[PDB]
Amino acid sequence: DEVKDYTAENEKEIVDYLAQNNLTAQRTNSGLYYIITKEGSHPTLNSNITVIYKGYFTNGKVFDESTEGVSYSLRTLIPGWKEGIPLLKSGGEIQLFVPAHLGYGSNGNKTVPGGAVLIFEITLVSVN
């Protein structure tokens, strides 16, 4: 077994990123940093949402792009989304700083290395 811990590394990288770029992010008990830029007029664990998100790394390299609304069940997503989406209503915009343990894990997948912080810009337009 080659288990690798990145919680401290991810947290310090997020702190450094928030120090370089002037942004204030609240921290949850699970280690997720979120910035809610605006709200609307809340999705649950069983709810279909439409997102215009965009996910990149700490260096600005985008690994996932969605300029058109995509429908998700909010129960099949990464824990970072499960903890960030119910924090805002339809029409709001949020920015997540999901660490490795709340994202793709310590092993990751192709084009996304393990132990990497993922910055998501999500625009929730529907909670159908």
């Binding site: 077994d1 099949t76 343990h101 894990g105």
Partner: protein, 319 residues
Amino acid sequence: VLTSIKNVQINYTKNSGTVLPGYTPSVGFLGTSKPSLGFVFGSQDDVRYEAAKRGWLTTYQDFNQSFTQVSNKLLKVTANIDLLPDLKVDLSMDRSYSENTSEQYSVDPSTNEYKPLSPYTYGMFSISTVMIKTAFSPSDETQSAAFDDFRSNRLIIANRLAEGHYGSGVAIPRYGDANNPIPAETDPNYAVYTANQGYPIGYTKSNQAVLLPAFLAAYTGSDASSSSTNIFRSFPIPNWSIKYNGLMRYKYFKDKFKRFSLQHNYRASYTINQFRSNFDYNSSPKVQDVNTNFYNEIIMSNVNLVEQFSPLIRMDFEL
């Protein structure tokens, strides 16, 4: 003490193939070398990006033909051992791996960049293994030790995969904790949560990556805490054939016996008839399926463990 081995027959066959459409330039009278001299003589190296940069790929942005690659690997190691003067042992190690990849492509009008589109992979796998550790265990419609091991190893493999995914930095989320409580009876996922409460969130009892290595460890006699969780195996385990004309030497010269030979064979293989890449395993935030299992990079339908004592024993003696 190692002089028993006499011959080590090693056969290794590697076939490769590459189909590239959209090749605009033509050929000459005696042939061509436009892509690369190696490609004509079988380099098999990447030429797609080079061809796009050189500008001799199709500029059509809706090209429906797919670039294809094929690879076949076959290892057929054979060895002979003579541990005893009247005992002959033959060892065989077989491994077949076929991988076919296909992908559409586009050429960027600017800078002529080769952009792949919807790449997928499939193929077959087989490797010689040894599963004699549970071969003689009693197993029928009423009892089976190997099946009990299969049932038990699922939780161990799920915990190992969770540790691999969740790198021990936080408590592993499970279906029985407060963070993921059992839903109401009207919830569609109530049955899934109730069936496996102590398992990690992304690794249930029906997850392929959980119960495939568990099955292999249970039916090969390996320990679930240290068995390999990888789909493919690299080192084939030898299968054996033993012949013994030795009992005739003790006292059977004048003990009414004129011939005596014992024969034994064991040959076991592990085969994946059709594995393939999964499109759901991508960079999208969706990581769980309808069964709340993490998507696997490689998906298969059946895995076959074949074991054959042919024969288990052969006593051939003439008086």
